Amino acid sequence: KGAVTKLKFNSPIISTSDQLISTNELLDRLKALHEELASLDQDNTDLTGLDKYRDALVSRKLLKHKDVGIRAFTACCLSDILRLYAPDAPYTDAQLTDIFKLVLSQFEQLGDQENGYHIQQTYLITKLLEYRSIVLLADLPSSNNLLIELFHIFYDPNKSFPARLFNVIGGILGEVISEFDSVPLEVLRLIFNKFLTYNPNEIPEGLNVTSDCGYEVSLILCDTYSNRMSRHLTKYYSEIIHEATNDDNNSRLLTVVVKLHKLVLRLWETVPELINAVIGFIYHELSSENELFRKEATKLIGQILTSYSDLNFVSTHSDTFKAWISKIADISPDVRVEWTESIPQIIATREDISKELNQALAKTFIDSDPRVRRTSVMIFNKVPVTEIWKNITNKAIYTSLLHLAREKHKEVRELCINTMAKFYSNSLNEIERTYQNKEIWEIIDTIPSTLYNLYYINDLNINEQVDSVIFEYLLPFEPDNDKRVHRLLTVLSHFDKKAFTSFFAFNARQIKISFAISKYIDFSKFLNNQESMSSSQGPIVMNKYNQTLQWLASGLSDSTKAIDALETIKQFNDERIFYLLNACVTNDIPFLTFKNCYNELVSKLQTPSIMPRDIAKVIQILLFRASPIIYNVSNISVLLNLSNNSDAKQLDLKRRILDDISKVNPTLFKDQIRTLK
């Protein structure tokens, strides 16, 4: 009651019919009153000689007064009233509501354009926080309605709050909510959806100085007030799920859970702590009755592991990560596939595990559904070869890969082959050997031997495929004379006898196919001009050409594309092509020029009964059996002894090779030693 400081303002504030106050006198009076109350000290202040204005500033004539200045100074005064009288809480709840609806007005005007009193409204929000008089809002009968309104205001798109106040706002909403045990769902929608809607790094641009109020706010509420927001977050998930499950719209439920899941994933990237608040439901969802909710749940965790995060998932919630690697044994395949589809991105983005994976993929490469097996090998394609050698190590993975190459199922087998061959070449041009990694290398080295044992099954499509594959990746046509042979030996290094006999057999057919494409052009040139319409051999040469073109088509899967392609070439009867063709099969061609004859020949055939794209894919695989790639000017290189002594695993090949090249045809063999002589 008696203090060292005291209130010095004593001018009337209420305008009556008796004594009236013009607007501008009132504005300056309230300006003074406001300015004075700010400087007071809550403790060493009179407080008694102040009830005069305590009662005055609540007259509905000032609250809902027109001039914005008056309302704004009326507020700033009332802000200090509470502050000073607190904790006694001078006003009744009804007044307090009428007051707190006015403060919601001033906040509303704070994001708008300047009314000339933005400062007065900046004072208001900041002080209501500092002296925490704000939380008086939560002991009212309408607090829920108010709480909603308060939120809708700052989370309103149509308002432009400056970036200075974001800290303050977050504080305001932060305190006021800590006072609630059960927060209305409408609010929580507002807060959380702001993670879904505003994604940063979405548009690439100059500065991204854009920024957003509501976003930065929900960060503040979930980081700082994690402890109290985490209680509420759990209510959101359950309520939302509860709302959509019981929705008449039966198919809503899936759509919202797929949305809830996306909400979670943003949070792990920003405030991973909060995941705890719902990591439960996910665990129960993985074991849900409904395979779709299990599928979606799987997908989710799958994404999580790939995400940058200050925290680490498997550590924090190992409870569930073990349930996740438990889904490689689910009943529903649609679930098993969704698991495997995510692996390639995980491995690329983390090395955390290589144990639960190397335990799991060994079960995935041998599942009963062929869909997953395709998803597994697609790893060896999708993720780079380096990462593979690093992360996956388990023996059983590399064995089961090569094993599917002899599988009945087609779509697997094909992808399997093209995969395990494009792997082998990368696995030599990149990864080097050591005292330890040479452990699994024995398997990577026996790939080319595997591929050759496929000829023995005697299919056309496969024999066409292995043909197309080997010359693509294993034995390329590039880039030099020497490194072809260097790698060619390393290919033959780990061969069994079948691999050799078939390796030698394929090459023994190269000379018998050459004698057939050569005597094809010599028989296909018979329609160049009128030799024998029915003269010299007309009735017997047309039936030796026509019955010889089948001999080369009998080994092609679609022979009804093979005898089709080369009679439209007698229809073209274009000599340029005949020369490039004849030049590839004629044996003993410098390996370099063969490449040039061969490359122009395939590019020329693209875009002139049915499509010539077919003729390009038929000739290409047929040429692989006709022309000399391996038996050529490489002999000169295997001739030059790379090594004087040592490399008994290289010279027994040099023999093995040269030992055969002289036998299949010494038309080419015995001549290079007369030049060397």
Binding site: H403, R406, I457, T501, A505, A508, W551, G555
Partner: peptide, 17 residues
């Protein structure tokens, strides 16, 4: 099931005529 090699080391990639 897995497929079986169905030729001999003698007649592999053979072509008559």
């Amino acid at each position: 099931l897995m497929m079986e090699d169905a030729v001999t080391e003698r007649e592999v990639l053979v072509t008559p005529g």
